[PDB]
Amino acid sequence: MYYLKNTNFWMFGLFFFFYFFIMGAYFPFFPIWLHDINHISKSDTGIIFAAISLFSLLFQPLFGLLSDKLGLRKYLLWIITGMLVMFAPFFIFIFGPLLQYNILVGSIVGGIYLGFCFNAGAPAVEAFIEKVSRRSNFEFGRARMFGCVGWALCASIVGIMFTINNQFVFWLGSGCALILAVLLFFAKTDAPSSATVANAVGANHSAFSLKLALELFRQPKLWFLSLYVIGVSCTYDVFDQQFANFFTSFFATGEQGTRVFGYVTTMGELLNASIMFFAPLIINRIGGKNALLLAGTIMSVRIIGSSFATSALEVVILKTLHMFEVPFLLVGCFKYITSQFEVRFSATIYLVCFCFFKQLAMIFMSVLAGNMYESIGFQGAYLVLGLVALGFTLISVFTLSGPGPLSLLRRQVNEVA
């Protein structure tokens, strides 16, 4: 509670909150804004989303390998924040109106060309704020819990006021970007008060080596983990990046249909919260490789159940069937990898794997479901992948490297010793 008085704690538990709150529209909602609001065929977003991934992938490095080391002098965030006061002014003026000039090609390109600030942006905010957090006293361990509740408070208003007035949310989105994103820059801090003098003296920068990857590349744990990451997660996300409309159509109208947009997510969070706590116990008292597959088992049922999607208050369940993976996978990797690779490796795993590969699977994969959807449908496409992926969660039963190689429980000293 010594955080009670903490200033830079107060000034960033807000930055987090009022940024995620900001992003707290653009994305989850996004899909609607395409189809409904701006009528665009699924397959045309299957190219949007697929392209979104192309900017990410070949960018994320440039912020990580950049800021992480070089620029750690509080700048970039101004670069990001800059492209944020132009939330609506882009969307409602440029992004939207561009594609409408039917050239999806050049329009979606000059699109997530302001989609990074959120995709590769957040992890950048999440970043600096962490670095800074740690140096101040009270880390990000709870200041984010102050930022991931903007999803919440927002969510409802974004799934509501948007319908009534689409410009509202977006227009307001640049404002909470203005006075709110900036106010925390003329009230920020950057001086490591009485610690060390140099930046290469006392931190926690694991490093990335090409060789490193190459000493990991011979490894089966790697490929066979990837297999999971890929198929399961990948094609899983793919499905969600274009699930909505589906679920949305099930209701009375758009208002009722959507609305359950805020109401949905805005709920599961206080539930994804719940899980969060009591996860480890399970996880660890369950093992990562194991408990991980159960997330993939879960996802599956969500794409697989979606073949049947009968009711509207069924599809709701098929949504909240979401926060049951969020946990299990998330940390299930953390403790899987950790617990199956030479620690210093993480870089490449987390890097190579969940990027120089995923976004890559995503470039392709997605597009398929975009055409898979428009030409054969939501339930149709599902059975292809709701299945195809299940054939991974199912094979990864073998595929993946089980419970401890040559250490029964002795080579276990990392979080309590």
Side-chain angles (χ1 to χ4, degrees), residues 118-139:
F118 273 175
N119 205 311
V125 172
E126 300 181 62
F128 155 119
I129 313 294
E130 169 262 4
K131 282 235 60 175
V132 170
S133 73
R134 198 157 58 183
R135 175 283 302 182
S136 164
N137 173 55
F138 209 117
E139 70 293 339

Side-chain angles (χ1 to χ4, degrees), residues 75-281:
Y75 196 54
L76 190 58
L77 272 61
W78 281 76
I79 298 189
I80 286 189
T81 307
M83 251 63 115
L84 278 292
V85 174
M86 287 224 76
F87 193 60
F90 168 61
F91 261 109
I92 313 299
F93 217 57
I94 301 175
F95 185 46
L98 246 64
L99 357 170
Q100 290 294 57
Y101 239 170
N102 293 58
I103 311 295
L104 291 58
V105 178
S107 291
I108 58 182
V109 171
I112 64 307
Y113 184 45
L114 199 172
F116 75 114
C117 79
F118 273 175
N119 205 311
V125 172
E126 300 181 62
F128 155 119
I129 313 294
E130 169 262 4
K131 282 235 60 175
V132 170
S133 73
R134 198 157 58 183
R135 175 283 302 182
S136 164
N137 173 55
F138 209 117
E139 70 293 339
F140 54 120
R142 214 103 77 77
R144 170 74 176 288
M145 289 181 82
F146 203 39
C148 222
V149 72
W151 215 226
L153 180 59
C154 195
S156 280
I157 171 174
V158 301
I160 296 171
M161 241 84 100
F162 102 87
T163 345
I164 313 182
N165 193 39
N166 170 37
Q167 310 183 80
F168 176 90
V169 294
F170 280 34
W171 223 52
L172 176 48
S174 297
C176 56
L178 201 60
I179 49 167
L180 291 190
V182 176
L183 193 160
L184 320 182
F185 283 118
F186 294 24
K188 57 76 181 186
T189 305
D190 44 301
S193 305
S194 185
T196 43
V197 291
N199 61 188
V201 178
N204 284 63
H205 294 179
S206 192
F208 171 48
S209 170
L210 31 164
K211 165 189 178 175
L212 201 63
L214 295 17
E215 193 196 307
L216 171 57
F217 265 179
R218 134 199 164 183
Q219 287 175 181
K221 312 181 191 298
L222 162 65
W223 288 152
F224 293 56
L225 149 138
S226 288
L227 276 163
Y228 183 106
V229 181
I230 315 148
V232 176
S233 166
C234 171
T235 88
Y236 160 55
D237 298 12
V238 172
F239 132 84
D240 230 316
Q241 78 172 40
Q242 200 158 178
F243 167 81
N245 312 160
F246 167 99
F247 157 83
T248 286
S249 64
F250 278 88
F251 287 75
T253 29
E255 268 278 286
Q256 269 300 312
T258 78
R259 264 188 183 182
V260 187
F261 186 53
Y263 299 65
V264 59
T265 42
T266 321
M267 184 109 73
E269 235 45 82
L270 299 189
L271 167 154
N272 174 43
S274 305
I275 48 120
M276 176 202 129
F277 278 142
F278 320 142
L281 322 300

